[PDB]
């Protein structure tokens, strides 16, 4: 409900809105937030990989406040890259997790549909990282 509250306070006035629409949005917001108070569900605070800070960051968060190290997306399912396993193609160069491909059995790149084998591409990215 924290993200819902942020989205609702964003939605109340973007640039311009008729009075009836704004009143309806406020009615929806007050109904939702007076049925029960905003409760934060617990989750796993995985250790951060962007920097050396011991302050763990929430799984959903990608902003990485106070560090400035934003995380690259994974075009497979949207999860941020929190592991060494990430590769990309030479057509769209987007990070991609091995486990997501294995679960989804994706024969092509999710964005650009590059028709090249993912196993050899993982090997090539591993070689490139070894070069670095």
């Amino acid at each position: 409900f924290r993200e819902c509250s942020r989205a609702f306070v964003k939605l109340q006035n973007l640039e311009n809105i008729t009075e009836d629409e704004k009143e309806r949005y406020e009615a929806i917001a007050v109904s939702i937030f007076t049925k029960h108070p905003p409760l934060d569900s617990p989750c796993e605070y995985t250790p951060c990989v962007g920097k050396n800070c011991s302050q763990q960051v929430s799984e959903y968060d990608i902003h990485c406040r106070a560090c400035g190290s934003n995380f690259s997306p994974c075009v497979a399912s949207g999860r941020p890259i929190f592991q060494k396993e990430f590769y990309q193609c030479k057509n769209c160069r987007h990070k991609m997790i091995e486990s997501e491909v294995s679960r989804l059995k994706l024969y092509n790149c999710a964005l650009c549909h590059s028709p090249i084998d993912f196993k050899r591409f993982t090997e090539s990215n591993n070689n490139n990282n070894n070069n670095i």
Binding site: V9, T34, H63
Partner: protein, 450 residues
């Protein structure tokens, strides 16, 4: 350097508009606080966070400021507003109650608490808090701001009174009228006071005109006292026509003249209502009520002798002319000539500037509904519902499509008679009913729910 602050502000301003990053916007003031704390730094980060609409961090910063500044009633009201805007009503209410218990001599705090209590839909406590403080602060009459607070309290009391009215009651509530009259009197007094002090007064003038409009609508809704409304609306029109409000503000006069058009339509005077409609046309070319009333008056003048010819002539003269187009669509449905109807809708759409106009979309939905096609008609009716006008008709047509797809008699005596289809259609009808109860009328809503 004395211009260091301005330099940093400008550097910030070229760092959110050229590079488009909110994080750096926040960081610009974050470094200002972190480098050296002061008695105003938390206030300015709170202001920046409000400008970016991040209520929780601003509330935390204002809490730190209130830690630094002992009383600082400005930080008190800022904290109250921030905690009200964070969509956490329990802690905001607790803070309001604590502050009221501490110092019961803060009128702004009482007004904010009343607004929050109205928001949470707790009328009893809200009224029990509003009435004593508003009825007691009658000793500082010469002061301007105290008069403004009294006016706001009376307005919110009237709003509370009108909120607790179950639908279907047609008894003119006198206490609301008296409270609104006191509010307009105090607003006139404070307008005079603001004129005395050489301050901008047109905003008070326009808000008083809006309150006049609300009073006129309230008095027209229940008791048909046409002369009193006519006089009040003339006074309001004279009251919004000072300074440079002629050109800058146009929605106010639009609402006044729509209201006048509705009253003249009720009074059954074609000439005066036509003159008012001409005034609307000179004001706003995209007025829907003017076109609908003109179509109705033309129907009154001619029905079946040569109405089709003059309607086609008017369609030829004016490109869109949506109301006459809808009437012609109805006639062509009545005469099995939907092909020339399609030609006419294509011709009107070719020069419609914007495709998704409410009138054109409504006409397209009606034409597709009359052509034995429910899907596209439903889509167009849903698209055209996004307006003040045509909402009731579109919702009724959608409900009829959901309930009666083949356009047959509702109850067939030959066999069964009711028609039951799945479960989602009924829930969609319920959603349309919930929209109609706030947008459409009350009697049609009753018919549809029945």
């Amino acid at each position: 350097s004395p211009y260091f602050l301005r330099a940093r502000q400008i550097l910030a301003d070229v760092y959110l508009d050229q590079l488009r990053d909110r994080r750096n916007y926040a960081k610009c003031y974050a470094d200002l606080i972190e480098i050296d704390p002061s008695f105003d730094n938390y206030k300015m980060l709170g202001d920046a966070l409000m400008k970016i609409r991040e209520p929780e961090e601003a509330s935390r910063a204002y809490e730190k400021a209130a830690l630094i500044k002992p009383d600082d009633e400005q930080i008190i009201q800022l904290l109250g507003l921030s905690l009200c805007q964070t969509h956490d009503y329990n802690k905001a209410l607790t803070y309001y109650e604590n502050a009221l218990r501490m110092n019961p001599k803060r009128l702004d705090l009482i007004i904010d608490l009343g607004k929050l209590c109205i928001q949470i839909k707790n009328f009893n406590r809200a009224e029990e808090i509003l009435k004593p403080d508003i009825f007691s602060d009658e000793y500082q009459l010469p002061t301007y701001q105290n008069l403004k607070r009294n006016q706001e309290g009376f307005y919110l009391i009237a709003k509370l009174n009108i909120k607790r009215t179950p639908p279907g009651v047609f008894t003119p509530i006198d206490m609301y009228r008296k409270a609104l009259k006191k509010s307009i009197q105090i607003q006139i007094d404070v307008i005079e006071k603001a004129k005395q002090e050489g301050e901008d007064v047109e905003k008070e003038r326009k808000t008083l005109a809006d309150m006049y409009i609300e009073l006129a609508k309230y008095t027209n809704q229940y008791e048909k006292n046409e002369k009193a409304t006519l006089d009040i609306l003339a006074e309001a029109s004279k009251y919004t026509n000072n300074q440079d409000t002629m050109s800058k503000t146009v929605g106010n006069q639009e609402k006044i003249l729509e209201l006048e058009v509705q009253m003249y339509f009720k009074s059954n005077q074609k000439l005066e209502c036509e003159n008012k409609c001409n005034l609307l046309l000179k004001l706003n070319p995209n007025n829907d009520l003017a076109c609908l009333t003109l179509a109705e008056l033309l129907l009154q003048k001619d029905e079946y002798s040569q109405a089709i010819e003059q309607f086609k002539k008017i369609l030829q003269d004016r490109p869109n002319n949506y109301g006459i187009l809808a009437k012609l669509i109805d006639f062509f449905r009545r005469s099995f000539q939907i092909n020339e109807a399609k030609t006419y809708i294509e011709r009107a759409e070719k020069k419609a500037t914007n495709t998704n106009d409410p009138g054109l979309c409504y006409c397209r939905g009606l034409y597709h509904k009359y052509n034995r096609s429910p899907k596209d008609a439903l889509n167009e009716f849903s698209k055209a519902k996004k307006s003040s006008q045509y909402a009731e008709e579109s919702l009724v047509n959608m409900i009829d499509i959901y309930l009666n797809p083949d356009q047959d008699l509702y109850y067939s005596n030959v066999e069964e008679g009711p028609k039951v289809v799945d479960e989602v259609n009924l829930r969609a009808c319920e959603s349309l009913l919930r929209e109609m109860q706030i947008r459409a009328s009350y009697l049609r809503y009753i018919v549809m729910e029945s």
